[PDB]
Design a protein around this ligand. Structure first.
Ligand SMILES: Cc1c(Cc2ccccc2)nc(-c2ccco2)n1-c1c(Cl)cccc1Cl
Length: 228
């Protein structure tokens, strides 16, 4: 994986992210002053646990669809066998959605973009999942302190996805090789943009997996109780 291989890998990932980012950073930032009123928040809080589950499930389904598109536009991902493509997406797509959230998060007031406006944690009260949602907000809060660029988000989420340590892979060595190349491409791009300092500031890999596991547990129950 030479210099042209590494640089082409960078450009390609950043392109693929720009085409699949779902919401433009510019729009998200412009919308920061569009905040839910006290009445609108109360409105959300009065909703049934079942309605909130439906609305959040819809939000997540759509977010996941763009992540699946992101992976398909990654040359290398398509070269893997069908089993491995599915293993990576099952294990990683929600982890990517978790990371992608920090762009739609405003650290100044602790609000997130949801169904057209920015709103706090308390919007989701009816779900009865305050501890989980609080950890999600905390995770986005810590990421926002890094001020990730669009291209950094692009490369970092590619690395969340292309991880050879997912159980159930059949061509492990081939996924490893793709991961190693993406790691080098990420490091390389950070050096060219004088952003090497964020590397020591990235969360431990277990943090995101751990958050996602607990997230998986809760949504599996809601699905079993009230199928979408
Ligand atoms: C509320 C929520 C949950 C927990 C949950 C979801 C469904 C049923 C029960 C509990 N998870 C996410 C979430 C976003 C990104 C990944 O997960 N949210 C979420 C957040 Cl924190 C902010 C905006 C939009 C959404 Cl949907």
């Amino acid at each position: 994986a030479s210099l042209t291989e590494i640089e082409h890998l960078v450009q390609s990932v950043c392109k693929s992210y720009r085409e699949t980012c779902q919401l433009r950073l510019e729009d998200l930032l412009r919308q920061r002053s569009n905040i839910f009123s006290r009445e609108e928040v109360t409105g959300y809080q009065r909703k049934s646990m079942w309605e909130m589950w439906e609305r959040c499930a819809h939000h997540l389904t759509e977010a996941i669809q763009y992540v699946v598109e992101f992976a398909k536009r990654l040359s290398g991902f398509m070269e893997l066998c069908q089993n491995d493509q599915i293993v990576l997406l099952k294990a990683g797509a929600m982890e990517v959605v978790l990371v992608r959230m920090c762009r739609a998060y405003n650290a100044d007031n602790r609000t997130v973009f949801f169904e057209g406006k920015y709103g706090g944690m308390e919007l989701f009260r009816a779900l009865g999942c305050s501890e989980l949602i609080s950890s999600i907000f905390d995770f986005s809060h810590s990421l926002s302190a890094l001020h990730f660029s669009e291209d950094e988000i692009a490369l970092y989420t590619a690395l969340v996805l292309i991880n050879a340590h997912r159980p159930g892979l059949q061509e492990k060595r081939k996924v490893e090789q793709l991961q190693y190349n993406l790691e080098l491409a990420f490091h390389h791009h950070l050096s060219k943009t004088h952003r090497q300092s964020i590397l020591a500031k990235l969360p431990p890999k277990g943090k995101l997996r751990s958050l996602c596991s607990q997230h998986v547990e809760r949504l599996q129950i809601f699905q079993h109780l009230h199928p979408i």
